[PDB]
Amino acid sequence: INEVVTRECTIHLAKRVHNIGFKKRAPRAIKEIRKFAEREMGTTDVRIDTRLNKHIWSKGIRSTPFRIRVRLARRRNDDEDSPNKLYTYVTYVPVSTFKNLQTENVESSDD
């Protein structure tokens, strides 16, 4: 009901991005974050923060690394009172040891 919640997600990203060529993978993989967000969130203006670019355009266009750990932060719009009010904030959590690193929500609402 509060819906300001902040989960610690996980992602398969290459599995999102077969049936596209390379050279658009992967600046497709940040306009297929904007479906990966809202299928778990519903809300709209997914403001992708500039920390996530320096791991996605890190190898270059050819492959995003296949597993990110994004923090979905549905944070309320403080002003600009458009009819939309809940938007999502993403950041970058650079963990590296990916077997059984479970996805969850235990995150204090002011990191």
Binding site for RNA (CB under 7 A): 5, 7, 9-12, 14-24, 27-28, 30-32, 36, 39-42, 47-50, 52-53, 57, 59-63, 66-67, 98-105
- Distance of closest approach, residue 96 Cβ to RNA, in angstroms: 10
Q: Cβ closer to RNA: 14 or 71?
A: 14
User: How far is C-alpha 94 from the geometric centre of its chain's CA atoms?
Assistant: 13
Q: Residues for the chain: how many in total? A: 111
Closest CB to RNA among 30 and 73?
Answer: 30
Closer by beta carbon to RNA, 16 or else 111 = 16
Q: How far is the CB of 27 from RNA (least distance, A)?
A: 4
53: enclosing H helix or E strand:
helix 53-56
On whether the CB atoms of residues 72 and 86 are closer than 8 A, the answer is no
| Choice between 49 and 85, CB closer to RNA | 49
Which residue, among 104, 83, 97, has the nearest Cα to 10 in the 3D structure? Answer: 104
Instruction: Give min distance, CB of 68 to RNA, in A.
Output: 10
Structural contact between residues 93 and 6, judged by C-beta atoms closer than 8 angstroms: no
- The 3-state DSSP class for residue 61 equals coil
